[PDB]
Structures are given as C-alpha cells and as structure tokens.
Amino acid sequence: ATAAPQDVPFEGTLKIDVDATDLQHRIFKVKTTMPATPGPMTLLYPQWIPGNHSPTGPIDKLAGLVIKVDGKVVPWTRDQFDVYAFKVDVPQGASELVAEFKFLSPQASSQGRVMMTPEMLNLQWNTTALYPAGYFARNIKAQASVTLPAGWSYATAMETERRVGDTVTFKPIDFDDLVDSPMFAGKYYKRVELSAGKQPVYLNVFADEAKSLDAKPEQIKAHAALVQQMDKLYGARHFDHYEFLLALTKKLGGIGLEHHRSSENSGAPNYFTEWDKSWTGRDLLAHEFNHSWNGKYRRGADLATPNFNVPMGDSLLWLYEGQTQFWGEVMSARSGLWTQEQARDMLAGVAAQYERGRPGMAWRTVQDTTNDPTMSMRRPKAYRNYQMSEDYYSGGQMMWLEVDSKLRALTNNKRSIDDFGKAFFGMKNGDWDVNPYTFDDIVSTLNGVAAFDWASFLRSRMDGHGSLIGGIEANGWKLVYNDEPNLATKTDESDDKDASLTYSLGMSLKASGDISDVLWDGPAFNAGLITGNTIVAVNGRAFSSDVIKDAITAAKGTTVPIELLVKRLDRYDTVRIDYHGGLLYPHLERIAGKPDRLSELYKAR
C-alpha cells in the first residue's frame, strides 16, 4: 500500500546519528533528520536486506518512535498493510523532519543474533535508519555518525570525515551504500594489511580478549594469498578498497554477510591461536570476499530492487550463492586457508549430501529452494534432508563443478570455470555499482567460453530430480564410503564427543544421546525416531559416541539387530535396528584412467 519508489532526485541529505553506548541494555539510540516536504510523508524502515534475500528487517525492535517537524511532534500512523511504513502529515511552510527512536538489539540469541557485548559491537545501519518512501534508495544522499563506547576502535569501508572524542562522523554517501557499509567496533582491535596498491585490502580483527589477535605470519599470508588468487581468477577488483570485518568471539552472534567493499564475519576466539582445530570454518572469508564480485557487483535483475521495501526475487541465487559456495571452498585450497586434503574431504561431504543425504530431491528441485529464505527465514525445520534447505548453496556448488568439467571436455581442457568467472565478473575494474544480469546472460557468457546448449544444461540440473554430482566423475574422481572418518566430520564432532551417523544409522546425536537430526527414510527414521528423542542405551550399555559406533561395527555383516533404548518424551522403549552395513563416511578416490582435472581446479594459480 506504499507508493512505488521512483528514479527521481532526492533533495537534501538524510542524516542518521546513532548513539551506541548502552551496551548493558544493548540499545542503539537513533536520530534521523531529513528535509520535510509539506503534505503526506511516509517513512520506511528497511525490510528486505541485501545479502539476506528475505524480509529480515527487525521491525518489532523499533521502539520509542517520536517524529517532530521543526520541533513540533506530529502523530504517526503505521500502514496496517505495510507495517514498515510510517505516515505523517507535514504542515505547510515546514523545513525539517526529525525521527528519534531506539533499536532494541537482541538481549539473547532467542531474539536474533547479539550485536552488542562488553568488548565489541556490530552496527548494521539498516537497523538504525528511516528513509522517505517514493525514491530509489541510491538517489538519497546520506550522512551517518555514531557515538562509540569510550576509547573503542572501529572499522568500516565507509570513509571517516572526523572523530571528535568518541563521536565518529563519516563522509556523505548514497543511502544504499550506507546500509552496505556496516561497522565493527571494540576494545581489542588489530588492523592487518592483506594487499597494498591502488585498491587495497585490509583485515580488521576484533576479539573478546586481546590474546586472540596474535595472528602468525604464515596465517596472514594465507589471507593475503586469498586476495592474490582472486586477482588471478577475475583480473579486476570491484571496490576502491576492501575492509574485512572479523569478530573472534563467543558473545557476538555469528554472522557471514557480504558487501561491496567489506564483509561481516565471525569466528571462534581460537581462529588464529588454534589454527589446526578451527579449519572447518575458514572458507568464510573466501566465501564473503567472492561475493564482492558475485552477488554485490553482479546481481540478478529481480534481486536488484530499487529500495529496501519492495520484495526481492531470489530466482538466480544458485549463481549468487551457489557459485560463491563453490569458489569459497576452491579458493580456500588455492590460498592455503585449507589444505588440499581438507578441501577434498569437504567436497566429498557435499557430494554425499546430494547422493544420499537429500531424499527430498525426489519431489523438490534446487530451483525451488531459492524461495527458502522467505519461506523459512532459517527457522528450525524437522527434515532439512527431506524438506531441503537453501540447497542453491551446496547443490549449486555441485552444478558449477559439473559446469567446470563440461567446459574442460568441450575445449580439451583449454577452458574451465575460471574463464567464466573472468568473463562474467571481470569487467569494469574499480566499479562497485550493481551490474544486473538475467538467466540469458549466464547462458550467453557460458556459450562464449565454449559453445553448448547451456540453457538446457542449467535448467535440467536446477529444475530436475536427477544426480547433481556428475562433475566429480567427469573431473576424474569417485565418491566412495568407508569406515574411515571424514576430516570435516571428525573435527566437527571431536572435543564434544558427538556422533554423525547419517550414512549408517541415518541420524546424528549429541554426546548426551539426544538425537539432533534424522535422515528421511533411514534406519532411525524407520524406527519412528525423531529429533529430540534420546538414545539412552545401546545393547543395554549407557550411551556414548564410542559405544554406539562400536555397536554399529559389531553389527556389520550379522543378523543381530542393534538394540537402542530410547526415551520419547516421558516414555522409554527399546527398538531393534536391522542395520548391518557398518560405519560409512564419504571420501573421494581417483579414477586411474581419467585425467585429474579436480586437482587442477583446486590448485593455486
């Protein structure tokens, strides 16, 4: 019920002033100031947030809203058919409108991801902004300022105009770039240069404790290598500078959010200090960095909306996120953030997920999962393996692996997916305005690398129910299963003594015995088990991860079922599982006769 935004000039500047000092209550106090045009005026709270692909704007956390025109309070009326829109009447002869309110950021994870801690904070300007309806967001000149906790450091891609005491004033910037220019701030801060030159790249690290900032030279080099490897792929940088924002924390809510000239990233306090233990999450910075090309600079036309309060079309997320998931893992290997063995076992896990871990592929397509951000909002679902869940990520990754193998086959290995990346994202170095694309543009660029009916190929994979893992065998490897633990699974289940048994008993368990996931149509599923049930005992022995694994091995090749004592709510029963295949974890093995194209893809350039 809000009038459509128009590509017309916005007169004046939208001033957004944020007080970020109330760490105890976790409150951001906001003052937004703009020219006031006489007549009806509608103010918008950002609803659809770029990078979330869904209406994640936290409208119910906007409180204390008072709107004054030239110092006089005017009553506001919310649109009952657009709860993000606030309507006021501006009197004749008026000059300035001021809206003051508070953003009540999460006081616990149940309200959303925590954005303030005693040592650090994360300011996302869309949560602290109101802007006029009727204008393309890029036409609104904005200027932001923030008052920090005393003495805190900060980092953002937005250029600073001045810091007076603890009040930082930034230079004017287009309103859409303001929302795209988040800030980290904290008391324990280290700035690390990743790439010098005319388009420099820096890593900004904030930590719960200063000891977490002790990054070693070889660890920084791997991050510097990531920037170099991306240069080899694209041959251009779509920013005048780039600022990684990295929070090493157990208090701030986890985040991985991409932007043109920055990204919001979270890691464990041992990101550097226990480098060998924290490897499974180290594709994050490579993933978010790739989005500066794929997602921020180039975006689906139906996703590149004129403001933050019209719906986004997610139809092409299998390129936005799918190929970024692909490059995130490949670049981790090329840069040294991951070893080649770690990257290979990661890839094996993805392949098994779509060969055996996604029975929902029988009825739903990967294309339909591009609607999952708006359908689910990452809220809990019973069967991620059967309902499926944002498989445009990892399912898209497998398709792009097959795309790479097909490009090589069509060109006798003279072309690969690297040539698509350079061709599709490598134009206009320095430009960080959005360059939209359609499905036909993807097909045409792929066809330019190597002529083929790419339209049919893409649609058959994304609208189909068949296998997505064809790129594995085409690039010279084969997905196998054995009792040797997967490196990712082993690392992701150790210390906690958890148990991932997806490909044996068809379920995952915590060390307590609580079932955390059940595979549709698997053995645990066929015994009526659901997530939240508890495995109390195995063959009469109190549950442990080692106990149930030894029982799975002991049941291999026999006809004696595994006896599981189960607690379902307030009832105990014993189930007999006739599973005799033993422990099964996915791996990749070479096909001796075929050329090893996979290692070429994952090799540093």
What are the residues binding a second copy (CB under 8 A)?
536-537, 540-542, 565, 567, 570-573
Closer Cβ to Zn ion, 328 or 522, answer by number = 328
Asked whether the beta carbons of 375 and 387 are under 8 A apart, the reply is no
Closer Cβ to Zn ion, 208 or 264, answer by number = 264
**By CB under 5 A, what part of segment 178-207 binds Na ion?**
none
Q: Is 558 helix (H, G, I), strand (E, B) or coil?
A: coil
Nearest approach, Cβ of residue 259 and Na ion (Å): 11
**Could you give the count of Cα atoms lying within 13 Å of 93 in the half-sphere of its Cβ?**
0
415 binds, among Na ion, a second copy, Zn ion, none (CB under 5 to 8 A by kind): none
And the tokens for 219? 């660890």
Closer Cβ to a second copy, 363 or 572, answer by number = 572
Q: Which stretch binds Na ion (CB under 5 A): 92-100, 105-113, 173-181, 311-319?
A: 173-181
Q: Backbone breaks in the chain (C–N > 2.5 Å) follow which residues?
A: none
Nearest approach, Cβ of residue 532 and a second copy (Å): 15
- Is 321 annotated as ligand-binding? yes
570 binds, among Na ion, a second copy, Zn ion, none (CB under 5 to 8 A by kind): a second copy
Using Cβ positions, the residue closest to Zn ion within the complex turns out to be 321
Closer Cβ to a second copy, 193 or 573, answer by number = 573
CA–CA gap between residue 80 and residue 89 (Å, rounded)? 17
Residue from 472, 426, 433, 470 nearest 448 by CA: 426
CA–CA gap between residue 149 and residue 221 (Å, rounded)? 32
Residue from 36, 61, 68 nearest 46 by CA: 61
CA–CA gap between residue 123 and residue 183 (Å, rounded)? 5
Neighbours of 355 (CB within 10 A): 18
Closer Cβ to a second copy, 232 or 541, answer by number = 541
Residue from 62, 56, 54, 76 nearest 30 by CA: 62
Give me the 426-455 binding string for Na ion, x by CB under 5 A, dash otherwise: -------x----------------------
The sheet with strand 201-207 has its strands ordered as 189-195, 201-207, 242-248, 262-267, 256-258
**By CB under 5 A, what part of segment 312-341 binds Zn ion?**
321
Longest dimension (CA), the chain: 88
Asked whether the beta carbons of 9 and 139 are under 8 A apart, the reply is yes
536 binds, among a second copy, Zn ion, Na ion, none (CB under 5 to 8 A by kind): a second copy
177 binds, among a second copy, Na ion, Zn ion, none (CB under 5 to 8 A by kind): Na ion
Nearest approach, Cβ of residue 536 and a second copy (Å): 6
537 binds, among a second copy, Zn ion, Na ion, none (CB under 5 to 8 A by kind): a second copy
Residue from 97, 241, 84 nearest 155 by CA: 241
521 binds, among Zn ion, Na ion, a second copy, none (CB under 5 to 8 A by kind): none
Give me the 52-81 binding string for Na ion, x by CB under 5 A, dash otherwise: ------------------------------
Closer Cβ to a second copy, 210 or 542, answer by number = 542
Rule CB under 5 A: choose which of 17, 119, 177, 390 binds Na ion.
Answer: 177
Residue from 243, 256, 217 nearest 336 by CA: 217
| Four-point Cα dihedral 219, 598, 256, 298, nearest 10 | 120
Closer Cβ to a second copy, 231 or 563, answer by number = 563
Nearest approach, Cβ of residue 514 and a second copy (Å): 15
Closer Cβ to Zn ion, 283 or 321, answer by number = 321
572 binds, among Zn ion, Na ion, a second copy, none (CB under 5 to 8 A by kind): a second copy
Nearest approach, Cβ of residue 485 and a second copy (Å): 25
- Radius of gyration of the chain, Cα coordinates, nearest whole angstrom: 26
- Is 258 annotated as ligand-binding? no
541 binds, among Na ion, Zn ion, a second copy, none (CB under 5 to 8 A by kind): a second copy
No. of helices (H) and no. of strands (E), the chain? 16, 32
433 binds, among Na ion, a second copy, Zn ion, none (CB under 5 to 8 A by kind): Na ion
Nearest approach, Cβ of residue 560 and a second copy (Å): 18
Asked whether the beta carbons of 384 and 511 are under 8 A apart, the reply is no
DSSP E strands, 106-182: 120-123, 131-132, 141-147, 153-155, 160-164, 167-170, 173-174
Nearest approach, Cβ of residue 539 and a second copy (Å): 10
314 binds, among Zn ion, Na ion, a second copy, none (CB under 5 to 8 A by kind): none
**By CB under 5 A, what part of segment 122-141 binds Zn ion?**
none
Nearest approach, Cβ of residue 7 and Na ion (Å): 14
Nearest approach, Cβ of residue 561 and a second copy (Å): 17
Checking phi first, is residue 215 left (phi over 0); if not, alpha (psi -120 to 50) or beta? beta
Burial class (CB in 10 A: 0-12, 13-18, 19+), 302: middle
Dihedrals phi, psi of 195, to nearest 5 degrees:
-155, 130
CA–CA gap between residue 369 and residue 282 (Å, rounded)? 25
**With binding defined as CB under 5 A, does residue 159 bind Na ion?**
no
404 binds, among Na ion, Zn ion, a second copy, none (CB under 5 to 8 A by kind): none
Q: Is 424 helix (H, G, I), strand (E, B) or coil?
A: helix
Closer Cβ to a second copy, 72 or 571, answer by number = 571
Closer Cβ to Zn ion, 243 or 321, answer by number = 321
Nearest approach, Cβ of residue 569 and a second copy (Å): 8
CA–CA gap between residue 330 and residue 338 (Å, rounded)? 9
Asked whether the beta carbons of 87 and 1 are under 8 A apart, the reply is no
The DSSP call for residue 135 is: B
Closer Cβ to a second copy, 130 or 535, answer by number = 535
The single residue listed with the structure tokens 């994304």 is: 462
- Is 287 annotated as ligand-binding? yes
Which residues in this chain contact Na ion in the complex, by CB under 5 A?
A: 174, 177, 433
Which residues in this chain contact Zn ion in the complex, by CB under 5 A?
A: 321
Name the binding residues.
287-288, 291, 321
Name the binding residues for Zn(2+).
287-288, 291, 321
